[PDB]
Amino acid sequence: XXXXXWXXXXXXXXXXXXXXXXXXXXX
Amino acid sequence: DPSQQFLQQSLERVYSLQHLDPQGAQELLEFTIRDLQRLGELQSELAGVADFSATYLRCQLLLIKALQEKLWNVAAPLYLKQSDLASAAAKQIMEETYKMEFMYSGVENKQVVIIH
Amino acid sequence: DANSALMELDKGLRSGKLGEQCEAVVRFPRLFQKYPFPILINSAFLKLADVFRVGNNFLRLCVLKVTQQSEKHLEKILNVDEFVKRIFSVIHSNDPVARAITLRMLGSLASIIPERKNAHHSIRQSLDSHDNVEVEAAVFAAANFSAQSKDFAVGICNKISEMIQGLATPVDLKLKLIPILQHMHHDAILASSARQLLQQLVTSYPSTKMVIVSLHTFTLLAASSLVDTPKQIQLLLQYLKNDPRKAVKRLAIQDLKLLANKTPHTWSRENIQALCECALQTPYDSLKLGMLSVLSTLSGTIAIKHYFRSSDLVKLAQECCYHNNRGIAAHGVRVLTNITVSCQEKDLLALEQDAVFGLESLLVLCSQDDSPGAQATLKIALNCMVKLAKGRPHLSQSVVETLLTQLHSAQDAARILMCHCLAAIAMQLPVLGDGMLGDLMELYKVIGRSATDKQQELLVSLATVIFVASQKALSVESKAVIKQQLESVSNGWTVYRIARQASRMGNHDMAKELYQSLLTQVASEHFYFWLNSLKEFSHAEQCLTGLQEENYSSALSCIAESLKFYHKGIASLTAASTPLNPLSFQCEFVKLRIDLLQAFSQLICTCNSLKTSPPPAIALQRCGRISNQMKQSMEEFRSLASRYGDLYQASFDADSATLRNVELQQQSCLLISHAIEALILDPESASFQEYGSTGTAHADSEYERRMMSVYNHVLEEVESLNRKYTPVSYMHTACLCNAIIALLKVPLSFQRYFFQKLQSTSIKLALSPPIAVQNNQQLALKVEGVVQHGSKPGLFRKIQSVCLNVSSTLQSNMTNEMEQRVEPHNDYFSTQFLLNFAILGTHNITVESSVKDANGIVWKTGPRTTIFVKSLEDPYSQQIRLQQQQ
């Protein structure tokens, strides 16, 4: 369990990153 | 007097565990400061001695936290005060020592020497 | 309007129909949430109390539910006496249900009516009633009033005692009646009497429900009233080792868990010894797992230092380390790891290898099963071995080796956790990264498409540990990774996260290729500009890697190419700035990197302008233009240091890692400024005893290790070349100008705040006073602001004080310099300033909002709101002033 894992602990999804995920995920 | 016995026991627990790592010393001081504050909130006649010893342990905790800062690991030209913590710590210990010396009625020379 | 809505739901409670009347009653909490005004909450609560007094019991229950849901708003009614009196009037009802509802009202209102004696008397009288609902409500009201009033508690303690040993009271009502003694945490003698009653009560009623409830209320009393704890712990251990029921032992276990979580420092060595002895001779794994959970909670605290050779705790941890139960094994491994990293005695050298091999056995047991309960023990084991590697460095090689051997023979969902563990270990010990690169790369190769759901997470985690492990660049492995993503994953989010990790760890050519592969995958042009800017930044940092050594011409070429790409990137980055979530930190960080690289290029140009542009015809001084050139370079680098500092102060939402990165850049430009000063400008005045006490170099990242190594090397070179040469020296320019190369050789790391916005907080700062004020009057700035915490409010830092600075600049200087440190109490603050405007004309005033955190660090985060003030003169005062002047 890395304390500084970015991909992990994705409960705190931002606004820009969430939209980026929605845009680059289903493609 | 269970409360007086607990206060003495917590103080000697702080005194007798002064050989730990800085993190453990900070944890012990935080625990004992919390216990002394709550004891002052419970036993009214021991409230003054409780927060007196709590302010002393807060002084020691601030000293320990200031002596374990990241600024000692960098050189003097690379030191930066915009993320400093020890400068506020020394001022806080000064304020707490003055508060300890002058807002407590039952002080004597045998306490004033440790305060100074 | 607030009062309009109040009348709108007020007209419904004289409807006569019970449905619209309960409608009207239960709409009240929404009104309280919308309009928290004390003069209006007061009227609403008074008419709620009136309809409580006149309504039926269902309306009274609705009023009770509203009162329970509005407990924080009923402290601001201030007409307490008549409100409580008109509720209390129907304690005299012959209906026991109405009496019960009123007792629940009084218990609900106990926060705002402590020491209210008729309420105490009503609770005491209703405790002896013959109706079960009234007695239960009286118990609830007594539990509430005992928490809020000690004068109620001292008599009700005796009353509850006498009606517990009263055998007319049934057993279930006794069970409901025991936890009143939990709130006896007011006086020491009160808690002592409660403990004596509980001690008689446990042995008097040895029922399992009675002993559960009595032991739990005894421990809540002992935790709240702190002078009860060692005897409570020894009582719990005695009941854990002697009482044969599994439920009693289970409460003793979870209760000692609570007491170890709350006050681990008060545990004596005898208590830990007794708990260990309990864990040795138990035959049940369900109890042993709980006891080891308590001991593992105790192991991570200072109770081990109070406990301390090979003791019963060590033997118990070794025994439970090799157990068929995975939870018991995880707890024993946790105890062993905490003991190992706690101290450095001679006895733990034997059990260090025991901890390592127990960790390896737990890995080989918890990896191939994919159980939901197996992943928790796997996380515990991997966190324990991360702690073992970080706390004690030398044995980390075996930990890394067993992780690498376990990776090739484990299921996919376990591989993400081991990749996280391996990345956490490898960022702290960099020598282990390069030795494990081949096996990890083979593991990346053998993926192909042999997963469908965990494939993405495994790919990003395994690429992350490739990037952390490879301190240098990639030549063929980059192509193999690119081919693996192109064949396997068309999901561009995995590519983006892998490129994000690559730019985090400094592998910028890989990030550049992945960002080129992603420009056609986005929908919004904003993300296209963001990805193009990221591609250009990665390309520029890759162009910076062409610095081989000592070649200042190739240095100028590489810095110029990197600058070209890098502010092409900032050209494409500010196009991605949005009104909602702007790219403020990214723009400032990239602008500061541009300014630092340009200052580096200018300093190398001054290196070349030593030998070129020879000194003037002059018989410091007699050095030519180069003295002023290094003076300007020092000023620029010090300005860069101050700008990195103000970026640090303006971030406030970053990690420790991003703040450390900004501090590293600031220290870099500070190092260059000091290297200019100490050996060009004034070597005599400078070069004091600047010996950095390099003790425990607790650098969290490999990038930080490289930066401090470069800093130490450059500082040692500066100190060794302080006064050995004249200030116009070829060695001075060479050592400084190679310090530039050493600083730029390590690649830049883009941290998490550059990519992910966590702890989004700001100040609304809605001030209330071009406004015009008379010359003789003084303007009053009634400034108020509300903070806006996003998701996690205190993930990294929390606001302690909001320091507001306001100053007035005439002729839209800075004469009304004012400062007030206000404390927000409900995430909202308000303070009022007094500004004087003697000079007539337009006065531009500005207000700042600095935030001081819990540690005392000032963060300049708030908006700089400006309003213009005009100082118009009274016609009578103007005429009087002109008459007096003329």
SS3 sequence of C62-87? HHHHHHHHCCCCCCCCCCHHHHHHHH
C-beta atoms of B13 and C698 within 8 A: no
Q: Which of C649, C667, C697 sits opposite B78 (nearest CB)?
A: C667
Count Cβ atoms below 10 Å from residue A5 Cβ, excluding itself. 19
Q: Is C23 exposed, middle or buried (0-12, 13-18, 19+ CB in 10 A)?
A: middle
* Residues near C218 by beta carbon (within 8 Å), at least 6 away in sequence: C181, C195, C198, C202, C232, C235
Residue given tokens 């009496």 in the structure block: C99
Among C residues 774-793, those touching chain A with beta carbons less than 8 Å apart: 791-792
Q: Where are the alpha helices (DSSP H) in C186-302?
A: 188-204, 208-224, 229-242, 246-262, 269-280, 285-299
Amino acid at residue number C612: T
What's the resolution in A? 3.6
Neighbouring chains of A at 3+ CB pairs within 8 Å? C
| Minimal CA separation from C703 to chain A, in Å | 15
Using a CB-CB cut-off of 8 Å, the residues of chain A touching C580 are: 15
Answer whether B71 touches C (CB < 8 Å): no
Residue of A nearest to C379 (CA): A1
Whether residue B112 lies within 8 A of chain C, CB to CB, comes out as no
The residue among A6, A14, A10 whose CA lies nearest residue C420 is A6
Touching partners of C (3+ C-beta pairs < 8 Å)? A, B
Contact list, C856 vs chain B (CB under 8 Å): 85, 88, 92
The span from the CA of C278 to the CA of C256, in Å, is 12
Residue of chain B with shortest Cα separation from C228: B2
CB B72 within 8 A of CB C693: yes
**Do the Cβ atoms of A6 and C504 come within 8 Å?**
yes
Q: How many CB atoms lie within 10 A of CB C808?
A: 21
And the tokens for C177?
């009646």
Give the distance from residue B2's alpha carbon to the nearest chain C alpha carbon, in angstroms. Answer: 7
DSSP, res C575 = G
CA C66 to chain centre: 34
Judging contact as 3 or more Cβ pairs under 8 Å, the answer for A and B is: no
Return the closest-CA partner of residue C24 out of C4, C42, C46, C51. Answer: C51
- How many CB pairs below 8 A link A and C? 89
Q: Decide if C186 touches B, using CB distance below 8 A.
A: yes
- Check CB contact of C67 with chain A, cutoff 8 Å: no
Tokens in use for C196? Answer: 């004596």
Helix C326-342, helix C372-391: angle, nearest 10: 10
Short-list C820, C757, C639, CA closest to A19:
C757
A interface with C, Cβ–Cβ < 8 A, is 1-8, 12, 14-17, 19-21, 23-25, 27
- Of all residues in chain B, the one with the smallest CA distance to C231 is B2
Q: Which two tokens stand for residue C428?
A: 């702290």
How far is Cα C283 from Cα C41, in angstroms, rounded to an integer?
60
Spacing of C-alpha C226 from chain mean position: 29
Q: Is B42 on the interface with C (CB under 8 A)?
A: yes
Cβ contact (<8 Å) for C518 and A24? yes
Cβ-defined contact of C524 to A7 (cutoff 8 Å): no
- CA–chain centroid gap for C269, Å, is 34
Q: Which residues of A touch C429 (CB under 8 A)?
A: none
Q: Which of residues 715-754 of C touch A (CB under 8 A)?
A: 752
Of chain B, the end-to-end C-alpha distance in Å amounts to 31
Is residue C10 within 8 Å of C25, Cβ to Cβ?
no
Those residues whose C-beta lies under 8 Å from the C-beta of residue C160, and which sit 6 or more positions away, are C142, C177, C180, C181
3-state secondary structure of C43: helix
- Technique that determined the structure: cryo-EM
Distance CA C730, CA C709 (A): 24
Q: Which chain C residues are Cβ-neighbours of A19 within 8 angstroms?
A: 524, 527
The rounded distance, in Å, linking the Cα atoms of C640 and C646 is 10
Q: What percent helix, strand, coil does chain A show, rounded to 5?
A: 35, 0, 65
Backbone dihedral angles phi then psi of residue B23, each to the nearest 5 degrees: -65, -45
DSSP state, residue C325: S
CA pair distance B30, B25, nearest whole angstrom = 8
Q: Do B42 and C226 touch (CB under 8 A)?
A: yes
Say which of C227, C265, C648 has its CB closest to residue B6.
C227
C474 — contact with chain A (CB < 8 Å)?
A: no
**CB-based contact B17 C305, cutoff 8 Å:** yes
Residues C39, C5 contacting (CB under 8 angstroms): no
* Interface contact flag, B85 C857, Cβ < 8 Å: yes
**Smallest CA–CA distance from B65 into chain C, residue:** C855
Contact between residue C32 and residue C44 where contact means Cβ atoms under 8 Å apart: yes
Mutation test of the interface with chain C: which of B30, B41, B78, choosing the one with the most C Cβ atoms within 10 A? B78
* Letter string b/e over residues C185-209, b meaning 16 or more CB atoms within 10 A of that residue's CB: bbbbebbebbbebbeebbeebeeee
For residues C129-155, one letter each, b for 16 or more C-beta atoms within 10 angstroms of the residue's C-beta and e for the rest, the string is beeeebbbbbbbbbbbbbbbbbebbbe
B27: which chain C residues are within 8 Å (Cβ-Cβ)? 265, 301-302
Distance CA C808, CA C749 (A): 41
Q: Which residues in chain C have Cβ-Cβ distances shorter than 8 Å to A7?
A: 457, 460-461, 464, 497, 501
Angstrom distance (rounded) from CA C173 to CA C135: 9
The whole-angstrom separation of Cα C194 and Cα C574 is 68
C689 phi-psi bin (left φ>0, alpha ψ -120 to 50, beta other): beta
CB atoms C688 and B76 under 8 Å: yes
The DSSP symbol for C625 reads: T
Cβ contacts of B88 on chain C, cutoff 8 Å: 856
